[PDB]
Paper text:
MLLs degrade N-acyl-L-homoserine lactones (AHLs), molecules that are used in a microbial communication system called quorum sensing (QS) to coordinate a variety of behaviors, including virulence and biofilm formation. The binuclear center, common to all MLLs, is coordinated by five histidine residues and two aspartic acid residues.
GcL possesses a bimetallic active site center containing iron and cobalt cations. The structure of GcL bound to C6-HSL (0.8 occupancy) is overall similar to the previously obtained structures of GcL bound to the substrates C4- and 3-oxo-dodecanoyl (3-oxo-C12)-HSL36. The lactone ring of the substrate sits on the bimetallic active site, with the carbonyl oxygen atom of the lactone ring interacting with the cobalt cation (2.6 Å) and the ester oxygen atom interacting with the iron cation (2.2 Å). In combination, these interactions likely increase the electrophilic character of the carbonyl carbon atom. The carbonyl oxygen atom is also hydrogen bonded to the hydroxyl group of Tyr223 (3.0 Å). The N-alkyl chain of C6-HSL is kinked and interacts with residue Ile237.
Numbering used by the authors:
A (entry chain P), B (entry chain D): 7 to 283
Write the structure that this text describes.
């Protein structure tokens, strides 16, 4: 039986309007007609599965050259979704401390292609990049239409193409994919974005874990009841996905790891302290 | 050839958070982390078609007993979506000034069953009430689960049932319905709410008119580009509906009358000044 080790890697912090994360979280009233929102902070992280069959990476955080005047992100983007991270937080450094080079990664699973998950895809030229086909198509249209604003970074996409990444698209109606012993890719479909992927991992000692990414921002999103994000591509799809994750967790007695939950993240054992067997 | 007269009836004004009407209209930034929304005012109105084949009413505004301590609307609702109207603004009074009694109405078309469109359904006991089946089912579930908050008013629904209204549901996949010479019901389906209906009218002198209701809040919603509302049941469905309306307007050279557009409403000839032939 395979005895993998799973690492949680801290890739810094982001802030944005709380309305993005929880829609109409604090609506104006007759007694508060100019209601104020908040500017909340949350973690960006990635997960490495050191599996005997090969190393698997879930998400890739933000590109190190995202912020600043010479940054890849448009000015309006930087102001609405600012990212802060020290050098040791960069993905390539986190991996380095584990004695892992990018070239050692067999599979990268991209939950979706937003700026905070697909930032460092270009690094893994020796891997197969697993992504939802609808998410891929949508991003490429953004590129082709020369969209310089939004959550799809023109400069990042440019780099993927130039670096000749090897893509494996998950089809709209494609089943879950067994990646390795006790590791399965979940096809969540349209919701938060054009197409979302998750991961289910079964560890001998710790048991089952579901990586939900932005299918579920936080425990507050999860509920119940469900509290959806401010902007959504497919509201119906989003609601269905959350409830599907809940069912899976119950039936397999698995933990659910959210995309950007500050409190949950504090509890994790990170790559600087150890791993999950 | 039939020569109808179409009347626009002013049924008062409402206010709410602008984020309801235009999602993320003013997002927080690093420089404005506690961004403020606004509390915007907009008209509630209904349309009467005095047709030789019979009188047709589109929407019914709010119930006269909605607001106040003894009001049908929950406190939280009254504070988030306050309605103001004088006595002459009440639907029953507007009709009276045209020498029209509720019993004279042959057809009522309910665009949807929100508090500001289905308020006075209970009045028209001599009419056939045309509504989307999915919208009807959803409202009845709110009632059955004893939901006392939200945009579906428990007390309003209660009254419909007690007054023994005569329902004709539009099926999910049912075609447009010819109601009378030059009057057609449009099935928009799920979007803003569970199920939306519109109307297309062809007048000898004025030409074509599309009544969109909450399928399109305002000219700003309409664009292009489309700016969706803060909360939506079916985002995908909503976007599709707007574009469908644009196509119809172009192909038939029809004006589009929005649900709650203050500027457009000012330009209408109201029932106090005349009608459209
Ligand atoms: C459609 C999803 C909302 C678009 C804005 C965005 O990309 N926001 C990031 C921030 C953390 O996770 C997110 O989705
Ligand atoms: C579809 C969610 C409803 C948001 C609150 C609401 O019901 N607002 C009114 C005001 C005019 O049209 C509406 O739907
Ligand atoms: Co995202
Ligand atoms: Co409505
Ligand atoms: Fe994210
Ligand atoms: Fe409305």
């Amino acid at each position: 039986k395979a005895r993998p080790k799973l690492y949680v890697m801290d890739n810094g912090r982001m802030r944005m309007d709380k309305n993005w994360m929880i829609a109409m979280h604090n609506p104006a009233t007759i007694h508060n007609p100019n209601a104020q929102t908040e500017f909340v902070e949350f973690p960006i992280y990635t997960v490495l599965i050191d599996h005997p069959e090969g190393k698997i990476l879930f998400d890739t955080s933000c590109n190190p050259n995202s912020m600043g005047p010479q940054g890849r992100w448009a000015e309006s983007t930087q102001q609405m979704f600012p990212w802060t991270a020290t050098e040791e937080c960069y993905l390539h450094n986190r991996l380095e401390q584990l004695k892992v080079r990018p070239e050692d990664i067999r599979y990268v699973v991209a939950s979706h292609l937003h700026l905070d998950h697909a930032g460092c895809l270009e690094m893994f030229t020796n891997a197969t990049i697993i992504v939802h086909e609808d998410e891929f198509n949508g991003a490429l249209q953004c590129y082709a239409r020369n969209q310089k604003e939004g959550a799809y970074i023109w400069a990042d996409i440019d780099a993927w193409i130039k670096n000749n990444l090897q893509w494996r698209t998950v089809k709209r109606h494609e089943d879950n994919i067994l990646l390795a012993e006790g590791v399965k890719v979940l096809n969540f479909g349209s919701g938060h974005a054009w197409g979302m992927l998750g991961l289910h991992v079964e560890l001998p000692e710790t048991g089952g874990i579901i990586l939900a990414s932005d299918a579920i921002y936080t425990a507050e999103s999860y509920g119940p009841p469900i509290k959806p994000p401010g902007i959504i591509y497919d509201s119906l799809g989003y609601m269905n996905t959350v409830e599907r994750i809940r069912r899976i967790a119950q039936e397999t007695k698995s933990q659910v790891w959210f995309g950007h939950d500050a409190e949950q993240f504090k509890k994790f054992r990170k790559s600087t302290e150890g791993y999950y067997e």
